[PDB]
C-alpha cells in the first residue's frame, strides 16, 4: 500500500521490509520514472521529445528496464503504457528472484564478528575497492575451492578498474571477507619509508544495502518464471518501437540490433550476466543524465569517476544540491536558461595539448 505509506509516514513498514526486492525493484523503477516525468514537465517536453533530445540510454542492472521503457515513450497520453510495462517487469523480477533465493537468518556470531571488525551487516553483495579484477578473482577462486557449487560466489559487477562487487550467499561472502581481512593492511599504517614495490595493499570492502544476490547463479531458476509471467501479462519490447539505442550491460551493444527477445535479454542481464559499466558506457557523449536513485552516492558519480579527464559532464538529475568542486552537475543544471546550464568538463589531452 504505497499511497498509504506516503500519506501516513507511520504506517510504513520497517526499512528491512522496504529493502526486499519484491518491494524494492518496482519502487526504484517508479522513482526513476517520476524523476523523468518531473524533468520532462519542467522543460515543457512530452516524454517523446525528451527522449528525442537524448542520443541513447542505458541502466546499471535494474535501471536497464527503465531505460528501455523511456526509449519507447511518445506522448503524455500513452506514457502510462510504458510505465506499466516497466513496473510489471520489475515486479515480476522482484517476486521471482525473491522466491528463488529468499533471505534467511544469519548466525548472530557472524554479525557480531562483522560489526566488531568494522564491516557492514552481511548481505548477498560485497563491494571491493582498490583491487583489480584479476586480484579479486584469485581470492574468489580460492574461497570457492572449498565451498560446494551451490554456495559459490562470483564477480557480479565490474564497476570500474579497481571497483568490483561480488555476489553470493551472505555466509560465503563473510568467509571471503575473513580471507580478505587476513590480507589487508591498516589504513593508519604508514609505509612512507617502505620501498614502493614492497608496500602492502590497502583496499576497502563493504556490504551493499541490498537484499538479493543479483547477477548470480542463485537466481537463474527465476528466469523462466519471469519470462512466462511477462508473456502472460503481454509485456514485450520490439526493436521497431525503441527510438534511441539502448546499450546492453554485458557487452555494451545496441539492444535494438539484437535479434532475439529484448525482454528476455534484459532479464538475463539483470539476474544472470555480470555488469561491465565501462564496456556499456564506452559510448561518446558530452553530458550524462542520472535519473537513478542515491543522489550523489549513485550511478552518476561513479561514472564521472570512471570518465574523469575525458571532457564528459555528469548531472545528477534527481537531486538539488550544490557541489563544492563543481566537477559534476546537479538538478539545477538541466533547467538553467543562462550559460551556467551549459558546463563542460575538462578534456586534458585538448586543454594541455
Amino acid at each position: 500500500n504505497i499511497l498509504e505509506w506516503l500519506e501516513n509516514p507511520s504506517n510504513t513498514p520497517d526499512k528491512d521490509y522496504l529493502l526486499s526486492i519484491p518491494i524494492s525493484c518496482p519502487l526504484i523503477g517508479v522513482i526513476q520514472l517520476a524523476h523523468y516525468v518531473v524533468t520532462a514537465k519542467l522543460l515543457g517536453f512530452t516524454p517523446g521529445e525528451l527522449r528525442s533530445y537524448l542520443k541513447g540510454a542505458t541502466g546499471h542492472s535494474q535501471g536497464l528496464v527503465t531505460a528501455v521503457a523511456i526509449a519507447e515513450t511518445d506522448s503524455w497520453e500513452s506514457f502510462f503504457v510504458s510505465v506499466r510495462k516497466a513496473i510489471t517487469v520489475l515486479f515480476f523480477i522482484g517476486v521471482r528472484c525473491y522466491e528463488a533465493y529468499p533471505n534467511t537468518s544469519l548466525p548472530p556470531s557472524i554479525l557480531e564478528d562483522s560489526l566488531e571488525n568494522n564491516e557492514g551487516v552481511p548481505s548477498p553483495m560485497l563491494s571491493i575497492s582498490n583491487l583489480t579484477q584479476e586480484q579479486v578473482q584469485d581470492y574468489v577462486n580460492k574461497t570457492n575451492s572449498h565451498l560446494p557449487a551451490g554456495k559459490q560466489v562470483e564477480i557480479s559487477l565490474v564497476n570500474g578498474a579497481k571497483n568490483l562487487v561480488v555476489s553470493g550467499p551472505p555466509q560465503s561472502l563473510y568467509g571471503l571477507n575473513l580471507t580478505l581481512r587476513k590480507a589487508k593492511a591498516p589504513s593508519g599504517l604508514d609505509q612512507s619509508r617502505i620501498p614502493f614495490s614492497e608496500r602492502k595493499l590497502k583496499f576497502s570492502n563493504r556490504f551493499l544495502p541490498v537484499a538479493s544476490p543479483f547477477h548470480s547463479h542463485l537466481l537463474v531458476p527465476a528466469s523462466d518464471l519471469i519470462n512466462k509471467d511477462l508473456v502472460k501479462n503481454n509485456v514485450s519490447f520490439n526493436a521497431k518501437d525503441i527510438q534511441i539505442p539502448v546499450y546492453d550491460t554485458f557487452d555494451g551493444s545496441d539492444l535494438r540490433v539484437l535479434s532475439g527477445s529484448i525482454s528476455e535479454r534484459i532479464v538475463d542481464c539483470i539476474i544472470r550476466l555480470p555488469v561491465k559499466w565501462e564496456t556499456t558506457t564506452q559510448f561518446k557523449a558530452t553530458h550524462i543524465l542520472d535519473f537513478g536513485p542515491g543522489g550523489a552516492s549513485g550511478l552518476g558519480v561513479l561514472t564521472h569517476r570512471n570518465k574523469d579527464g575525458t571532457g564528459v559532464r555528469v548531472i545528477v538529475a534527481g537531486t538539488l544540491d550544490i557541489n563544492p568542486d563543481d566537477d559534476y552537475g546537479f538538478k539545477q543544471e538541466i533547467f538553467d536558461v543562462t550559460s551556467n546550464g551549459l558546463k563542460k568538463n575538462p578534456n586534458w589531452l585538448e586543454e594541455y595539448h
Partner: protein, 94 residues
Amino acid sequence: MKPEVEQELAHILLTELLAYQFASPVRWIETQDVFLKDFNTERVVEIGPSPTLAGMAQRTLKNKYESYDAALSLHREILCYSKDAKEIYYTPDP
C-alpha cells in the same frame, strides 16, 4: 553381528592396538587431520598439565586450514585444561 560377538572382537582389537602401540610410531599428523577436517571439530579440549597438544593443534591449523576455516566460517577453539579452565567450565569472570 550379535552384541556379544561384537564386544569380543572389539576387546580383541582394543587390547591388540594397545599392545602394539609402544612399538609403532605415533601417527599424530593423521589423527589431527581426522579430527580437524573429517569432524570439523569446533572445540578441542586438551587434558594434561601443559598446553602441548593444544599448541600442536594451533600450529597445524595455522599451516593447513587457514583458508579452509575462513571459507567454511569455522571458528575453532583450542582449550587446555591447565589454562583455559574458565572457557571449559563456563565460569566467566564477574
